[PDB]
Amino acid sequence: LAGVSEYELPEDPKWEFPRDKLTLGKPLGEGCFGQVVMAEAVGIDKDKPKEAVTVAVKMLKDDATEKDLSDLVSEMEMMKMIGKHKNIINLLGACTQDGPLYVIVEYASKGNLREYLRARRPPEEQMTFKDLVSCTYQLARGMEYLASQKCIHRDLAARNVLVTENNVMKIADFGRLPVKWMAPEALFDRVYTHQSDVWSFGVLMWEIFTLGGSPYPGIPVEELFKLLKEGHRMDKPANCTNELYMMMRDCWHAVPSQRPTFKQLVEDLDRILTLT
């Protein structure tokens, strides 16, 4: 059949948004999470109607199969049940009735984190140490919230983190291989846990304080795991403090048991931010 659902089983929640006010635009980001497209909806905020608002629409790929539609609908329901948080790409609407499936989510005016930092390097809006710490604390708080809802990240890194007009860091992908980013136990056993996500967040912080730097440069993938099991971790970023680098290294602890929980990280980063 098709995603217009001639004989498929939908439902009708309140989240629905009139498709008569949605306008789709340019594909945004290489669609690993799915077919995302920029859009200019009208009256999504419910308190400022008639005001044009940019959003991102998740739609089905041209050769999508039934299981892709089921995954999209289940992802929609998961985003509904997850809840709201300031440091996350939040669900704000959907079009499910009398037409194709469109999941309307929050749009960040400024690109992913990697290119944001890279375009704000001192070779405009220069990124100073305090901005980096605030950013890190933001998405760490978001990571904790996502941890509460038993969520595991598909690929956590700078290119999958967005930043809005208000410079608010938002996390995506909370649902090819990012071997350069995953922990040794996730490389070897291919199991992803909150501890593996702590290691991934350590790599994320490294990428932040190096202002969009490629992890493990020059080390081949075939060798990577071995070097990681030897205990070789990435070196300290240029403009970074010994305490933040020790935090990164604790996130990269060889055993998951001794890695700090996300709440520990949020507390430590709040204390560091307290001293501007």
The interface partner of residue 112, options being ligand UIM, a second copy, none and the CB cut-off 5 to 8 Å by kind, is ligand UIM
Contact 254, 231 (CB under 8 A): yes
Specify the pairing of strand 91-95 against strand 24-27: unpaired
CB closer to ligand UIM out of 61 and 130? 61
Using CB under 6 A as the binding rule, whether residue 28 contacts ligand UIM is answered as yes
CB closer to ligand UIM out of 40 and 75? 75
First to last CA, the chain: 58
> Exactly one of 155, 173, 250, 268 is catalytic; which is it?
155
108 annotated as belonging to a binding site for a ligand: yes
SS3 of 10-31:
CCCCCCECCHHHCCEEEECCCC
Segment near ligand UIM (CB under 6 A); pick from 105-113, 139-147, 211-219, 238-246: 105-113
Using CB under 8 A as the binding rule, whether residue 220 contacts a second copy is answered as yes
248 class by beta-carbon count within 10 Å (0-12 exposed, 13-18 middle, 19+ buried): buried
The interface partner of residue 220, options being a second copy, ligand UIM, none and the CB cut-off 5 to 8 Å by kind, is a second copy
Contact 237, 213 (CB under 8 A): yes
Contact 141, 169 (CB under 8 A): no
- Residues comprising the binding site for ATP? 28-36, 58, 106-108, 112
Binding site for ligand UIM (CB under 6 A): 28-34, 36, 56, 58, 75, 89, 105-108, 112, 159-160, 162, 172-175
Residues serving a catalytic function are: 155
